[PDB]
């Protein structure tokens, strides 16, 4: 499935690489929002099929971020 933004924020960094198998609740990427560096968790285990965003990108609530396999 698709993992969208839990809130607005700029991308600090991406923890995972494509093809990387993810763990439920594991760290996918980091968004600097409300003076915090927010780590975004994987709703399911899986594999990094697609990294939909870049570092330094401004994302908004619900925007597509990661697509797993």
């Amino acid at each position: 499935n698709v993992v969208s933004a839990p809130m607005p924020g700029k991308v600090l960094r991406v923890l995972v690489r494509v093809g990387d198998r993810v763990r439920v609740g594991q760290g996918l990427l980091v968004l600097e929002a409300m003076k915090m560096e927010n780590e975004i968790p994987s709703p399911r285990d899986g594999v990094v099929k697609r990294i939909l965003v870049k570092e330094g990108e401004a994302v908004d609530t619900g925007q597509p971020l990661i697509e797993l396999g």
Binding site: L12, K35, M36, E37, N38, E39
Partner: protein, 232 residues
């Protein structure tokens, strides 16, 4: 044996001779609220906005597990909690530290501490690095440098934890109290430059956004992270 007397923060402290990062550990472990992570030295020390942090032995490097349950609109104040917490500890030791928007405390404009807050869904990690007796980077200072002698590491810890606990309880009562403490304790009147206009750092708003006064007189608000800022 620590003899702490707090309600939430400091009810459990976990100490490490050394570690990559207290913040990482705090994030990656299941820990009750108010638990403190403290190490003699960190090797993979972290800083705000993907920067690095020197954590040599002799300083205080800790992480606090918090679970406030507050509107998103109040989450930007958590960093302030830590800074003001530090300011008040230095005040006890007769050191005058001021806040540099929005996560650094300074003494005579030399960095003596920094805050880093990280999110983990329900979990919120407050990380604070303060220079006590450790060796420090050029341009930075320490309590030992400020006071000209060794400062009791435990005493600084007990003091800081104690201020952060109180500040936390009042934060759960009225998250608006911190803003004033900050406004009343941060460097102001300084001409700054935004990269990517220039003006005066005259204040912050109720979201903790820096308020710059342009030369014409217009006002501009800065969101942390969104722009690069510098002192002139």
């Amino acid at each position: 044996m620590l003899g702490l007397k707090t309600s939430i923060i400091g009810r459990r402290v976990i100490y490490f001779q050394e570690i990559t990062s207290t913040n990482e550990f705090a994030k990656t472990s299941y820990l009750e609220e108010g638990t403190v992570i403290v190490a003699d030295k960190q090797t993979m020390g972290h800083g705000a906005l993907n920067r690095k942090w020197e954590s040599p032995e002799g300083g205080l490097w800790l992480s606090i597990v918090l679970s406030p349950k507050v509107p998103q609109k109040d989450l930007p104040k958590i960093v302030f909690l830590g800074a003001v917490g530090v300011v008040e500890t230095l005040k006890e030791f007769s050191i005058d530290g001021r806040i540099k928007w929005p996560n650094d405390v300074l003494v005579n404009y030399k960095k003596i501490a920094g805050v880093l807050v990280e999110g983990k869904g329900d979990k919120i990690v407050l990380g604070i690095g303060l220079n006590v007796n450790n060796k420090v980077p050029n341009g930075a200072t320490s309590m030992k440098l400020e006071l000209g002698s060794e400062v009791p590491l435990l005493s600084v810890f007990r003091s800081l934890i104690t201020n952060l606990d109180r500040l936390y309880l009042n934060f759960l009562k009225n998250p608006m109290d911190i803003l004033n403490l900050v406004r009343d304790n941060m460097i102001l009147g300084v001409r700054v430059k935004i990269l990517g206009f220039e003006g005066i750092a005259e204040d912050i708003d109720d979201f903790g956004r820096l308020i710059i006064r342009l030369d014409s007189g217009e006002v501009k608000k800065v969101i942390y992270g969104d722009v690069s800022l510098r002192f002139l």
